[model samples]
Target: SEFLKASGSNFYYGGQKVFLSGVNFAWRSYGSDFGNGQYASNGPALKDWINKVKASGGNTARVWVHVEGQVSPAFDSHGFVTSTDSKKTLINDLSDLLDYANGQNVFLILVLFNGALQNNSNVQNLFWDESKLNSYINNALTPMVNALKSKPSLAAWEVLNEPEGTLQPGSDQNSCYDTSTLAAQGAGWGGKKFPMKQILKTINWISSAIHNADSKALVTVGSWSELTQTDSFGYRNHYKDSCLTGAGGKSNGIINFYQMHTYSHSGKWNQNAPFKVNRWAYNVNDKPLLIGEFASVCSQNEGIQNLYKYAYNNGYNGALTWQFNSGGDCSDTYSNQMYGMQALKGQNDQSGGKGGMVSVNINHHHH
Candidate 1:
């Protein structure tokens, strides 16, 4: 019944140190998961997925809402954000989702967009056009944030999932190449890559919107890997406060936490895998770090049970398996994720099992 908050390097719930153990619910149907009545139509399946997560002992799940603007937040011919398709649908769906997740004793992290979408063309203008970007802030994002900002189960607003996929490494507003981190030359992210500065600005502005609407709201961005988010790989951490305040031009624009996704193949020798290294080795400061995602099963990587149990004990606040129901080689089936979920099901609980999953009991978002 309490909102998740950061206290130094730990997450606190009801003023007591707690840990978030879960899976990335990610989506039930990708881009169509939440807007344009799809959420209504997909309601049963979504509910089933949430139930599966809870049954798996998951206390939270990250849900991706928009992927390259397939539907929600209607865009104009020239590419300016208008509003959520059918305006009322997205708000209603998410509000209800908050309620449903609350009932299931699970929290939800709503990912606003995805830059790594297989088809990224549709979102180009929205990311590059200043006015179009502003439109998203005013017409689409802020309204949604305001509507659900008060929910206890609304864990965080992830600005984008893997925005780094489209960013040029080591590049700033003046350049658009990921030279330092990826070690690629001449537009490694290709023509679609925007300056790192732009992406950060986008994140900064979005964070400010959520914070301005509700100062207590938690905000995060899912980094492609620890290789980019930490100094361990020789790349500087960009999400720190000094690097974030410019775009929104305010101090509130900083990300509340650092969320890095990891996979065995993401970095040289797979050193980026959280289970492969010690947490204190990371240069993360200013905020608690949460392993936003990791493959449920992979080579040279500890399984979910091992990783999640070790996560909180080794200085991390949370560890969410990459997926719960998806069936890719990298994705663990719902059954497998469940087997891992129970690994730390009652982590941080009091001696008498007093600190388990915190459930939200009300649905108060009224648009």
Candidate 2:
């Protein structure tokens, strides 16, 4: 398969402009205790989920590579593989997932780390320590990239899942920093406020490392939509300017595309809200862009339909909804808090007909 490329704000596949209608297939069912958080280890289950996604008009699956909690392929306190057996377990599981995705003709965006895990004592220092970052790149990231680089289904590598949330005072806090003030006041990570520049450098370094491992591989940061918003006292996740280019106004060449996740809860309900805002903010940069995650707060089917239309109609590459559920007890009390796509029409609906699939065509050029 030809590698996917970015020309302006669009993604090209097989030399044709392509739009990816995708869904986030997170390992654990968000708050559920009965699910498999280590997705790579669940071959039959993962394949079944992918089949449902493809049957639902999705062509891509965005999965997370978590290092904490019940997630599989555990790393030691030093951020290295726990053991030879664990390393092999991870490799085989990932290979199975990649092979299955390839067979299903689905593309995958693998998020390397989860920023929310930074508070955990087991891996908290990954944000501030250079050595742990290095160990992660060499011992964990590089191996995973190498193992799956040959698979055509591998779409891109997301350096971190919403790292902007890492600096917040608490694990549940959803705000970002006033970077300008944080940088000025000298907020410490372990002692003083963590330097935002160091955080950017870590992301840039990991991105470059990914490219070194596979030049054809695309890279992005799992930033939230708030990055595009103005920096205010209440907003803490404000990383728009730094993540897109760099600390200054220079290009972070390692990232081939810019990624942002959105949801309808925070007054962004209009179909065109994200498209309009992101276009104004990122389109001028001339790189491929995507709303990595999004869904409507009300009426799951209509909300996703509108988002899919907006993504295709606008100059953006495409959008991926919050998620597709893998097998589990998935109690609604916990699951409802998440933006699962199972409620969407045609999504896992095997009753024949169009299966409620929403289709859109990409214009060859966006001028």
Candidate 3:
């Protein structure tokens, strides 16, 4: 298996520890891009973006799929995901994208859902309703994993992007911070407020489904705050195995690494960001922790390039900037994000091979 392996707090391939220096190649057609029709319309643009990222010395690109279930998965009145529009659409298009990413020397972090899903009334019940949730597990995610399991181009699978945005502030407010400080945290991100228990259940269910299909498949949740990610600011590390299980997640449904997104959207507290504090401040020793999303637009203190340098120097596992061009002047151009990664390129490509990245030419198909 050429899948990325984790040891201590680093990712290894063929016994060579390499840093995942990259950017969010995020999406081509936004939320619905994974659908066959959507991909058919704009798949080339997706490849072009990664090609450029690879050219800039990036080996990985985190991209989004099935965001909010707006386009691909067909849902019923019961909120059960019946099929992936055309079952082959999402799977086949993703296979094609992974194939192309390989040609350009890139691995993908495939984000499966978004916290914004809770906002869509048609699909919101999938969060709390076990039966409806099963439909997604058995119908969509399971098949997708079975099709792409162990595929090298697909580096890892993320359960949701910024899930806490939908967190119901009143349900389980962090006692560590003042109510006013945490009140408007997730504004504009989530559609509805959900209990922390429910959020954990959804993540565990999807994560469990992926692992059940492929035991070695890497999984993570893109936590928006370091404070809530672990016990930093009096919030719980809700993604921990015990928390997941207690929240109704299957025992095997656990994240392979701890990932947190950083954006000093507000100055409520300094501990919430990697830029605000050292990486070790998180007190994480059990698994590798990666900065799944951070943009210069959101960069405080120093320039984003310095932040990129700080990640590896400070002992964090990996760092990837936010959306290629979607974040405007803050994260701005792909070149800006690439600039951050480019500085770390030569040193970051620590694979054993002199040719750089690990050799993974596995065929991708859906039959």
The lDDT for every candidate, in the order shown, is 0.71, 0.55, 0.72
Clash totals for all candidate models: 4, 13, 2
Candidate 3 lDDT by residue in tens digits, 1-367: 4657776666766566766778886776767788757887778787888877777777788998877767867786667888876645888888888888867767889988777444576556777789988887887888889888746778899988777677665443533222233446553355446666777888888888898899888898888778566766665576877777666738888888889887765523355567666556777757778888887766665676787777776667778887785654346467777677776666735533212232323334333
Candidate 2 local lDDT, 74-102, one digit each (tens): 55855654421243455556667777776
Ranking by TM-score: 1, 3, 2
Alpha-carbon RMSD, each predicted model: 3.7, 8.5, 3.9
Residues 1-367, model 1: lDDT tens digits: 3678876665666766566777887777767878777876777877887888777767788888877677777877777777877555888898898888888878888888886542555466655677877888898888988888778888788888777677655633422223464635222333446567777777787788889888888888887677656766565576777777855466798788888877664423264556666566686745778888876565345566776777766667677886765756467677777777787655555332123332323233343
Better of 2 and 3 by TM-score: 3
lDDT (Cα) of model 2: 0.55
Model 3 residue 221 distance off true place after TM-score fit, in angstroms: 0.3
